[PDB]
Design a protein around this nucleic acid. Structure first.
Lengths: 178, 97, 278, 559, 171, 112, 87
RNA sequence: UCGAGAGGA
DNA sequence: TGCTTATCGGTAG
DNA sequence: CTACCGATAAGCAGACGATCCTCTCGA
């Protein structure tokens, strides 16, 4: 059993706090400002579909490098197969849930290359909004200012309707080609 | 053979913590029970096959811990529970001192 | 009742005698911080005797013909005579010896010398003469500077309490006192030669074997001390049994287990209230 | 473990929090409703009724049940049930506390007699204790029995300012058995002329006051905000203990054989069912109190039957009932009889005899005792073949084994087992093998006074049913071979085997720290002979001098 | 919806494995139990990040057994949903009641009621479909769904989503 | 000045009937009887009613009486004594159990 | 409260290994050798795990680290190699 | 199993 | 070995 | 001279009293 990180204190029963919703009312475990293994007070680490995609690959590519070290003593359709083989070399057949996620992340990635992602993250995580709001802006493709305000209700009063429209067009130009 | 009060005190004086525990637990009582992380009481409905480890009046199947305690100690906590006294067993330190 | 009262009492890793709650009972177990099984009844030669015999056996006077060391005891008997620098350390040696006499008499007021103390120094000197097969006719290899400083360095190596601050350091000095006084009493510059005739090879081994026997004699953190004390007081109570004390007239005085009941109960009872006046 | 694997993580209880049961949480905790006062037979047929005993809890005769959780008699600790009380009832142990609280906190308004404005109140609250802080509150609030609205005059110029509610006179309260009575004064040229007015104080009255008591007023009297609230000192709902607490037993087959508390709890139900109808139907006022007092008595005698000044209570035939207080009471009763002293497995005892051909650290174990005792030895490449000969020699030939525990929790009783002859013995298998020679094992003697009496002795299997031992090691045990009986406890781990040999060993305990001198020495025939020997008058010829040197085990061979 | 969560697990290791090839076995036993598993408290534990530089501290040995308790501290990726979260995935299962959508490792269902009225299920089509005018939902077809409700269930989080709202529907 | 006379009155009982007891044992019980402020009585009221946790004190005489008061005042047992761990059936912090032991990975490869 | 841990530098405890530390180290190491744990010292036909646990100490090839607790809660992580065995 | 008595080092 | 509760007589208001 | 502040007595129950071990005899 795990259940660690943000623990203590449970002072009898407790009314479960509140419901988990997209109105920034997140779980009693997921806070905007949380702790760290080092001990520092770090901001919530939320990633969108293109951000997280490159994050999981970075680890699994490095995993194959380390696992084979101890043994001694791009493109649309080609990315699908390369990831499929990579999951077989690092993880066992038991992890079915990971295979479904990788297939989904690569198919719906708004920004395939790491080069584009850097600027995207420097464009959104600068505005002064919640890290999860970013994880939905970079995930969901929005053309209208009102489209983004409806899908991500956490905004509405947080950002100006026109100022947000400026951002939407930049991500449209930043978009990857499939 | 009884390992009474006098028999305990001598093994204490020696400084032998494990033998005293071994005579009191494994060689005598010893019981493996499930305790709640929230209420801290043995209220746990622990099912070892269907894994339904729910606690009535907590609903959780997460914060649950197994413990190696004597049958006489468990019985004492149950006797005090019947006497409107709550000996809420807490695994975590909340005062340090 | 005794063992249930002193259950929690145990020596800690900071040489202190605390309990379950964490309150301090003794800052250093038994005032000295020693393991009770590593102690013998040893006599102190500083407190015992007249001031005339004490002057004869311990005073080293290089600046005299009759009160100096004969060259049949030391290798450098003639060149050590009448030295100013060497006698300074032998004035320091005797002034530390006269300090112990006035301090020991301040403590053991009755005049008792045979006190329970660790490290059998009386046996270490006995064993030294056997280990090296030393004769009395031939002189020692060492000098006065080797002896007086040898004991000085030895007193430093005896670490009961490990410290860095003024408090633990002053507590370390208090913890020894009685022992390093017996050590001054037994390893006096003249006593080493006049009585033992110890060589540099023998003396060096003796200092090293003294600190080793002393560090072995320190308590073991985890020792149930209070639990052990309870049995060490509880057990003799079963053997007594038997009141009259005269003497020294004391006929109607509560003695043994009936007297003990009152002490442990307290309970303001009359029983034997007879107060002593001087 | 109490058998089988568990998914949840195991951890040492670093602290235990005490408190009281909230009658609200007991209803949430409860697995069974509890209605029928009968226990045995479903509907006077067979297999325990859905009322008392297993309605949805603790299993009975060779049946698993246990509210769908099953597991059976072994592995189930029992599950608590609840019972709603018709009218509130005071708890036996808190009779004094409730009396003192009502004498402190003033009723009608539901607030303290003393307030922050009083200098003595500041002096009483100053100590941030719990019991000692409350001790000072008890003596001050004891007198001046009347509530106040305005009191400051020597902190404020002259005029008084508001602080409290209704200024009602607090009555003097005394304990008249199981109930409390408050005496209201007044009488100043009005009603009752001189003698004060007496009103009986029922649980319902007291509980209402205690509910109205402020959160800060609890902390002043030393109470908790969630663990111990004054409202929980008066029972409105009773938790019923499951069968592992109050067993069924049942001798023969078609019999009851129930525990004392199983009958006592049914008596409460019988005292409750009467009130249940009395409060519902034509209420005769002073006929309900005559039954309510019986329920107040039944609930109190269940917890404490020792008990008070005048009541006693018995379970006819003429013998009282065993209460919970009397069940876990001092000296041979749960705390002392079952948790500070326990009868333990892998032990032995027999009449003790002395021997000069034994070593100081050795003990002469009779051949049967070593044969009827086993130590668990795990199968490693360091033993295997050794254990293989113990397995084949079995439980009859002295150097043998009784039980072979596999990788999975399964015992192979060689006395029975059909495959006793074969057995391949896989690695990491526990072998309950007979106690061999030179085994470090705890040798006891009663009374065990000082650190000694319980030393570790180097085992030596020898014939004749009597515990042999060295003669010089008689002083640490203080016994003599005039029929003295000594205990023995066999360790069951490699840890405890070292914890004995490297701490409790006979030579380690040679020098008694009690008096900083040894507790052992040469005595009797050895003492008498050494005096006769060590003198100038006696000499030994060549024929006897060589045998004398040969008798020494550590002899150089040099004459 | 994806989060990088810092967390730790307690591992009890047998003494027969106390060798040089122990820390590599500690890490393997870790991702054997944690990676792939799902918690209601944290979400779907997808992948364990940084196999190198993993703090294990020191494993305290247990009282009457040679086993040691290691508190392995690690960093992993979690997929946790919310009751209001709008996510775009692919429809997999389809019938008369509604359709199931695969959003990452989690299956989300949409009822005939939670979807628009001006659609209706088409039985006479293989694979089963949902038509409207020119827009048809089949065995695949990518859609945008708003999570109306979130369900715990065993060690596999499931949800109940809707496509009947402005700027939702199909993509 | 009291602890010295208390020791003097305790020593006189041991000295009257032969067998010697090491100063430390007698100085100890006396030091426990004084380090409280005054004279701690070795009875059900004197020492038994102390700062110690509910279990350490319920082990001696006042059983159910102490448990009631433990639940009334909501007393917290810190589980750091002899009796409490003895009851709980846990390896108590006494001698051998007065320190936890871990295994070092740095040293594991160092010896191979 | 947070971390506490007195470093391997500046230590108030005794460098000598207490009989209690030795006995736990020996008991547990013998328990491990008894639970098929790997031996670091070059064994010489020793059938008893306690006999092995004793020769592991003579060569100081034990990977066990002792956590010696203080009454205030703080701890000093001392290794078997550091601790001098005199007794 | 409970309760009462007898006896032992 | 304690505790509990009236009665008492006394200084100052 | 009276109201109040604490003084000593009147009245007054509480719960504990070696550690282990052997055996019979009922209701």
């Amino acid at each position: 059993s795990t259940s660690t990180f943000q623990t203590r204190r449970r002072r009898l029963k407790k009314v479960e706090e509140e419901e988990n919703a997209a109105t920034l009312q997140l779980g009693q475990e997921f806070q905007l400002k949380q702790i760290n293994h080092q001990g520092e007070e770090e901001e919530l680490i939320a990633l969108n579909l293109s951000e997280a995609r490159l994050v999981i690959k970075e680890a699994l590519v490095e995993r194959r490098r380390a696992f084979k070290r101890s043994q001694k003593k791009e493109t649309r359709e080609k990315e699908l197969e390369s990831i499929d083989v990579l999951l077989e070399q690092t993880t066992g057949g038991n992890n079915k849930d990971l295979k479904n996620t990788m297939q989904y992340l690569t198919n719906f990635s708004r920004f395939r290359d790491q080069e584009t992602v850097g600027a995207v993250i420097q464009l959104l995580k600068s505005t002064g909004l919640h890290p999860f709001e970013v994880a939905q802006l970079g995930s969901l493709a929005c053309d209208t200012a009102d489209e983004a305000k409806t899908l991500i209700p956490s905004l509405n009063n947080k950002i100006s309707d026109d100022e947000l429209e400026r951002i939407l067009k930049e991500l449209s130009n930043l978009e990857t080609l499939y | 053979l009884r390992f009474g009060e006098m028999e305990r005190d001598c093994m204490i004086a020696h400084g032998a913590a494990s033998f005293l525990k071994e005579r009191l637990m494994e060689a005598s009582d010893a019981f493996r029970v499930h305790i709640c992380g929230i209420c801290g009481l043995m209220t746990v409905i622990a099912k070892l096959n269907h894994n339904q480890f729910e606690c009535k009046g907590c609903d959780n199947k997460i914060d649950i811990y197994q413990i190696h305690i004597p049958y006489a100690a468990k019985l004492l906590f149950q006797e005090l529970m019947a006497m409107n006294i709550t000996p809420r067993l807490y695994t975590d330190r909340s005062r340090d001192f | 009742r005794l063992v249930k009262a002193l259950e929690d009492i145990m020596v800690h890793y900071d040489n202190t005698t605390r309990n379950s709650l964490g309150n301090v009972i003794q800052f250093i177990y038994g005032e000295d911080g020693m393991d009770a099984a590593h102690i013998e009844k040893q006599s102190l030669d500083t407190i015992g005797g007249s001031d005339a015999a004490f002057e004869k056996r311990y005073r080293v006077d290089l600046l005299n013909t009759d009160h100096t060391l004969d060259p049949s005891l030391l290798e450098s008997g003639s060149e050590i005579l009448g030295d100013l620098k060497l006698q300074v350390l032998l004035d320091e040696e005797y002034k530390q010896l006269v300090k112990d006499r006035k301090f020991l008499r301040e403590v053991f007021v009755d005049g008792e010398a045979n006190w329970p103390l660790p490290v059998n120094i009386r046996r270490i000197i006995q064993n030294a003469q056997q280990t090296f097969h030393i004769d009395h006719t031939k002189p020692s290899d060492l000098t006065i500077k080797d002896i007086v400083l040898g004991v000085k360095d030895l007193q430093e190596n005896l670490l009961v309490l490990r410290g860095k601050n003024e408090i633990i350091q002053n507590a370390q000095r208090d913890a020894v006192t009685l022992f390093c006084c017996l050590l001054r009493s037994r390893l006096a510059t003249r006593r080493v030669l006049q009585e033992y005739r110890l060589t540099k090879q023998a003396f060096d081994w003796v200092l090293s074997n003294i600190e080793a026997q002393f560090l072995r004699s320190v308590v073991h953190p985890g020792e149930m001390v209070g639990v052990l004390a309870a049995q060490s007081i509880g057990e003799p109570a079963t053997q007594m049994t038997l009141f009259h004390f005269a003497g020294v007239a004391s006929k109607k005085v509560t003695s043994g287990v009936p007297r003990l009941k009152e002490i442990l109960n307290v309970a303001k009872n009359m029983k034997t209230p007879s107060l002593t006046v001087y | 473990v109490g058998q089988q694997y568990s998914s949840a993580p195991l951890r040492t209880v670093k602290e235990v929090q005490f408190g009281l049961f909230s009658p609200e949480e007991v209803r949430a905790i409860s697995v069974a409703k509890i209605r029928f006062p009968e226990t045995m037979d479903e509907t006077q047929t067979r297999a325990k009724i859905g009322g008392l005993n297993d309605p949805r809890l603790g299993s009975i005769d060779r049946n698993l049940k246990c509210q769908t959780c099953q597991e059976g008699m072994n592995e189930c600790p029992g599950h608590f049930g609840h019972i709603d009380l018709a009218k509130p009832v005071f708890h036996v142990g808190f009779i004094a506390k409730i009396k003192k609280v009502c004498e402190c906190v003033c009723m009608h308004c539901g607030k303290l007699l003393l307030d922050e404005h009083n200098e003595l109140m500041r002096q009483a609250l100053a100590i941030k204790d719990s019991k000692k802080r409350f001790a000072a509150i008890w003596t001050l609030c004891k007198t001046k029995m009347v509530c106040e609205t305005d009191v400051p005059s020597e902190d404020d110029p002259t005029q008084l300012v508001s602080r409290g509610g209704c200024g009602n006179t607090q009555p003097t309260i005394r304990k008249d058995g199981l109930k409390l009575v408050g005496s209201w004064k007044k009488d100043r040229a009005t009603g009752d002329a001189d003698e004060p007015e007496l009103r009986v104080l029922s649980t319902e009255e007291i509980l209402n006051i205690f509910k109205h008591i402020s959160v800060k007023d609890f902390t002043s009297l030393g109470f908790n905000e969630v663990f111990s609230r004054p409202e929980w000192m008066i029972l409105t709902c009773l938790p019923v203990p499951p069968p592992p607490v109050r067993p069924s037993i049942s001798f023969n087959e078609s019999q009851r054989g129930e525990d004392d508390l199983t009958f006592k709890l049914a008596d409460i139900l019988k005292a409750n069912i009467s009130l249940e109808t009395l409060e519902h139907n034509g209420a005769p006022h002073h006929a309900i109190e005559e039954a309510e007092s019986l329920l107040q008595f039944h609930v109190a005698t269940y917890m404490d039957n020792d008990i008070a000044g005048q009541p006693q209570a018995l379970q006819k035939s003429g013998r009282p009932v065993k209460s919970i207080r009397a069940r876990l009471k001092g000296k041979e009763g749960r705390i002392r009889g079952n948790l500070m002293g326990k009868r333990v497995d892998f032990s032995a005892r027999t009449v003790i005899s002395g021997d000069p051909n034994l070593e100081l650290d050795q003990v002469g174990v009779p051949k049967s005792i070593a044969k009827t005792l086993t130590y668990p030895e795990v199968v490693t490449p360091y033993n295997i073949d050794r254990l293989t000969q113990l397995v084949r020699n079995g439980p009859n030939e002295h150097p043998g084994a009784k039980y072979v525990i596999r990788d999975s929790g399964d015992r192979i009783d060689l006395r029975y087992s059909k495959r006793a002859g074969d057995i391949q013995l896989q690695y990491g298998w526990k072998v309950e093998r007979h106690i061999m020679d030179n085994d470090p094992v705890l040798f006891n003697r009663q009374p065990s006074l000082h650190k000694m009496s319980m030393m570790a002795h180097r085992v030596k299997v020898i014939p004749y049913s009597t515990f042999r031992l060295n003669l010089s090691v008689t002083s640490p045990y203080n016994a003599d071979f005039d029929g003295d009986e000594m205990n023995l406890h066999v360790p069951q781990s490699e840890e405890t085997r070292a914890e004995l040999s490297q701490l409790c060993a006979v030579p380690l305990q040679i020098v008694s720290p009690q008096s900083n001198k040894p507790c052992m020495g040469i005595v009797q025939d050895t003492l008498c002979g050494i005096r006769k020997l060590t003198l100038r008058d006696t000499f030994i010829e060549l024929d006897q001098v060589l045998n004398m040197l040969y008798w020494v085990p550590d002899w150089d061979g040099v004459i | 919806m994806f989060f990088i969560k810092d967390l730790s697990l307690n591992i009890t290791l047998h003494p027969s494995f106390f060798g040089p090839r122990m820390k590599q076995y500690l890490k393997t036993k870790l991702l054997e139990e944690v990676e792939g598993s799902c918690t209601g408290k944290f979400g779907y534990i997808l992948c364990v990040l940084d196999y190198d530089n993993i703090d294990i501290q020191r494993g305290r040995i247990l009282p009457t057994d040679g086993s040691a308790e290691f508190n392995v501290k690690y960093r992993a990726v979690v997929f946790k949903p919310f009751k209001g979260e709008v996510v775009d995935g692919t429809v997999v299962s389809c019938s008369q009641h509604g359709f199931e959508v695969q959003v990452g490792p989690m299956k989300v269902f949409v009822t005939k009621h939670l979807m628009p009225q001006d659609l209706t299920f088409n039985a006479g089509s293989n694979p089963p479909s949902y038509q409207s005018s020119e827009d048809v939902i089949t065995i695949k077809s990518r859609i945008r769904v708003k999570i109306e409700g979130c369900i715990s269930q065993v060690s596999s989080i499931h949800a109940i989503g809707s496509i009947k709202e402005d700027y939702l529907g199909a993509i | 000045a009291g602890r010295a006379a208390l020791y003097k009155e305790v020593y006189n009982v041991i000295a009257s009937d032969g067998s010697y007891v090491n100063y430390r044992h007698m100085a100890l019980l006396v030091d426990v009887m004084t380090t409280q402020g005054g004279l701690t009585s070795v009875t059900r009221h004197g020492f038994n009613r102390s700062n110690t946790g509910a279990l350490m004190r319920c082990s001696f005489e006042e059983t159910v009486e102490i448990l009631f008061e433990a639940g009334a005042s909501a007393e917290l047992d810190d589980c750091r004594g002899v009796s409490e761990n003895v009851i709980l059936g846990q390896m108590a912090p006494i001698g051998t159990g007065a320190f936890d032991v871990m295994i070092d990975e740095e040293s594991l490869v160092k010896y191979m | 409260l947070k971390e506490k841990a007195i470093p391997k530098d500046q230590r108030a405890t005794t460098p000598y290994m207490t009989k209690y530390e030795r006995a736990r180290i020996l008991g547990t190491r013998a328990l491990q050798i008894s639970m098929n744990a790997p031996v670091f010292v070059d064994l010489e036909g020793e059938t008893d795990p306690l006999r092995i646990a004793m020769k592991e100490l003579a060569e100081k090839k034990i990977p066990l680290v002792i956590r010696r607790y203080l009454p205030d809660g703080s701890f000093e992580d001392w290794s078997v190699e550091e601790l001098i065995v005199d007794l």
